[PDB]
Amino acid sequence: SLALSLTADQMVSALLDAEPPILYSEYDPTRPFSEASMMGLLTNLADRELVHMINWAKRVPGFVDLTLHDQVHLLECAWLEILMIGLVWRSMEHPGKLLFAPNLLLDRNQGKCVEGMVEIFDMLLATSSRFRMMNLQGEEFVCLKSIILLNSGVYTFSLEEKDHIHRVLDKITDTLIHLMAKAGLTLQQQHQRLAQLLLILSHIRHMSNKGMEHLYSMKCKNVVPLSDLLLEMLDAH
Amino acid sequence: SLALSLTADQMVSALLDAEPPILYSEYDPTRPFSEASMMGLLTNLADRELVHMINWAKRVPGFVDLTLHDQVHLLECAWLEILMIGLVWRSMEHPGKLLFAPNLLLDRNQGKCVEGMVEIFDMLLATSSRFRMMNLQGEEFVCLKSIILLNSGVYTFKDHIHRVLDKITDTLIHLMAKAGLTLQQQHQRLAQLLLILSHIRHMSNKGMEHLYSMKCKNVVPLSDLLLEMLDAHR
Amino acid sequence: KILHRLLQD
Amino acid sequence: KILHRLLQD
Ligand SMILES: Oc1ccc(C(c2cccc(O)c2)=C2[C@H]3CCC[C@@H]2CCC3)cc1
Ligand SMILES: Oc1ccc(C(c2cccc(O)c2)=C2[C@H]3CCC[C@@H]2CCC3)cc1
Structure with missing residues (x-):
């Protein structure tokens, strides 16, 4: 393989260059709210993000070597997790807001819809x-x-x-530790932060499972229709 | 608190002594099993395990310092995860088998009855x-x-x-250092252990939906304690 | 709830 | 299998 032959700094660069762009939505701030329309926007956005995620996964070291069947399975299981952690990352500098898109900020209040x-x-x-x-x-x-x-x-x-x-x-674990060592963190502080980061992944899994049930609910419901790709990712669970 | 003032050796001993006992299932009904039969044994077992888990939680360093409300919330969220990782641990030296109880070893084929x-x-x-x-x-x-x-x-x-x-993270690293693992081997194994927790969370949510489905069918009556722990995930 | 009673005893 | 297609460029 070529993944194991990579240094920590090179590993970062490869992943950093493979980053997908931040997509815009068809949101109209003249249109007020709704709940059919919001989900319609979120579905349209997530469907376009999936296309970039799939081509992003190809550039992740090691993912290329795997069987096509293995690649399909890994994406089918983690696609909502990856969407969420991306969403969460984009929303770091926006307290109380979830930056789904640069032109779509949303609020906890607007989450009452749906x-x-x-x-x-x-x-x-x-x-x-x-x-x-x-x-x-x-x-x-x-x-x-x-x-x-x-x-x-x-x-x-x-x-x-x-x-x-x-x-x-x-x-990747070695890479994470290498980064923390650069930031001047002690050997004890590296272990703690490493644990802290990976424990968050447990909650991202939880949110994904919750979100997966929510998406399945709107599928069996008569509205709003999901994309042909999302229905395939959803039936996988 | 008193948890932070503990050495990792003292932390281990505290948790090791806090361990709940391995309970037995009802010796009746005995195999073979049906749907109502198996779930009846599992519900009864899990309900009795819950009582020991709650007492075990009090023995966990730092858990006492929390408010009663917070203690409730934590147990409500993680009770099935704790049962599962307990089940998995008991079934380690029983490959292909799940040890719910010393007198209740289940196969994969038996899982199809439900x-x-x-x-x-x-x-x-x-x-x-x-x-x-x-x-x-x-x-x-x-x-x-x-x-x-x-x-x-x-x-x-x-x-x-x-x-x-x-x-606890400091404690996990200490244990690995004792085993003679190198620094690189310490972070790696720590990551491997904590990544499994992500799958345990997944199993719990899958299991939570299963129990909720059984509750709706009204067939096998859940205990009032289990119903409260289950309703917390709604 | 039952959970409280078992946590106080 | 849309996912299978996109994985095959
Ligand atoms: O970047 C994104 C974009 C969209 C999402 C989607 C989503 C996903 C698919 C369809 C849909 O309508 C919404 C969701 C988020 C998270 C939970 C699943 C749903 C519904 C509530 C918001 C998550 C991250
Ligand atoms: O140690 C135990 C004991 C019981 C379980 C229970 C369980 C949990 C609650 C009620 C019930 O009837 C079964 C379950 C396991 C895991 C998923 C939920 C259910 C059903 C299949 C096996 C898990 C671990």
């Missing part, structure tokens, strides 16, 4: 506030996001492929 | 096989379980809880 969505908003807001108090760095973010991609579906796999995935996961 | 339960079994068996290849030690296990207790509900509210979580 039954059950307000609870998920609070959890996303709490995650963003956590990232803010930890002063999460961009280099640490791209590490965590790539960890989610490889780890979320690794426990649902003749195959020495799971061993190669854990090897890459160990490399 | 609609949608066999998928949770596989995830549990995979976690057990994962613990086995890592050779998870008991001292590491009691650390992981307390972490689940304090972490799983800390974002649905707390500087104290994070300080204790750091202390």
Whole structure:
């Protein structure tokens, strides 16, 4: 492989260059609110983000080597997690707001629209506030996001492929530690922060499962229609 | 508090002594099992385990310092995770099998008697096989379980809880240093252990929906305690 | 709730 | 299989 032959600094650069762009929505601040329309916007946005995520996953070291079937499974399991941690990261500098798009900020109050969505908003807001108090760095973010991609579906796999995935996961771990060592953190502070970061992934999994149930609810409901791609990602769960 | 004033050796001993006992299931009805039969044994077992878990939680350093409300919220969020990681740990030296009780060892094939339960079994068996290849030690296990207790509900509210979580992190690293693992091997294994917690969370939510589905069907009557713990996830 | 009673005893 | 397509550029 080529992932294990990478230094920590090179690992960061590869992930940092592979970052997807921040997409805009078709939001109109003349149009007031709703709940069919908001979900319509969020569905349109998430569907376009998925296309970039899929091509982003290709540029994640190690993901290329995996079987097509393995790649499909990993994305099917973690796609909402990756969307959320991206959303949370974009919203760090906007307390009480969830920057879905530069032209779509939204509020906890606007989460009351759509039954059950307000609870998920609070959890996303709490995650963003956590990232803010930890002063999460961009280099640490791209590490965590790539960890989610490889780890979320690794426990649902003749195959020495799971061993190669854990090897890459160990490399990303070394990369995270390398970064914290640069920031002047003590050896004790490196362990604590590493733990703090990975424990957040447990809550991101929780939000994803909650969000997955919410999306399945609006699917069996007569409105709003989901994209053909989202329905495939949703049926995977 | 008193948790922060503990050495990692004292922290281990405190958690190791706090361990709940391994309870037995009812010796009747005995296999083979049906849907109503198996869930009846599991509900009864889990309900009695809950009582011991609550007492175990009080013995967890730092958990006492929290308000009663916070103690309620933490247990409500993580109770199924704690049962699961307990189940997985007991089933470690029983590959392909799940040890709910010393007199209740279940196969994958037995999980099919309940609609949608066999998928949770596989995830549990995979976690057990994962613990086995890592050779998870008991001292590491009691650390992981307390972490689940304090972490799983800390974002649905707390500087104290994070300080204790750091202390357990310091404890986990200490244990690995004793085993002769290098510094690089210490961070790596720490990451591996905590990443499994993400899958445990996933299993719990999958299991939570399963129990809620059983509740709706009205067939096998959940205990009033279980109903309260279940309603907390709604 | 029952959970409180078991936490106080 | 839309996901399978996009993975195959
Ligand atoms: O960057 C994004 C973009 C969109 C989301 C979506 C989403 C995802 C798919 C369809 C949809 O309508 C909404 C959601 C977020 C998080 C929970 C799932 C849903 C509904 C509430 C907000 C999350 C992150
Ligand atoms: O140690 C234990 C004991 C019981 C469980 C229970 C359980 C939990 C509550 C009520 C119930 O009937 C079953 C469950 C496990 C895990 C998922 C929920 C259910 C059903 C399948 C097995 C898990 C671990």
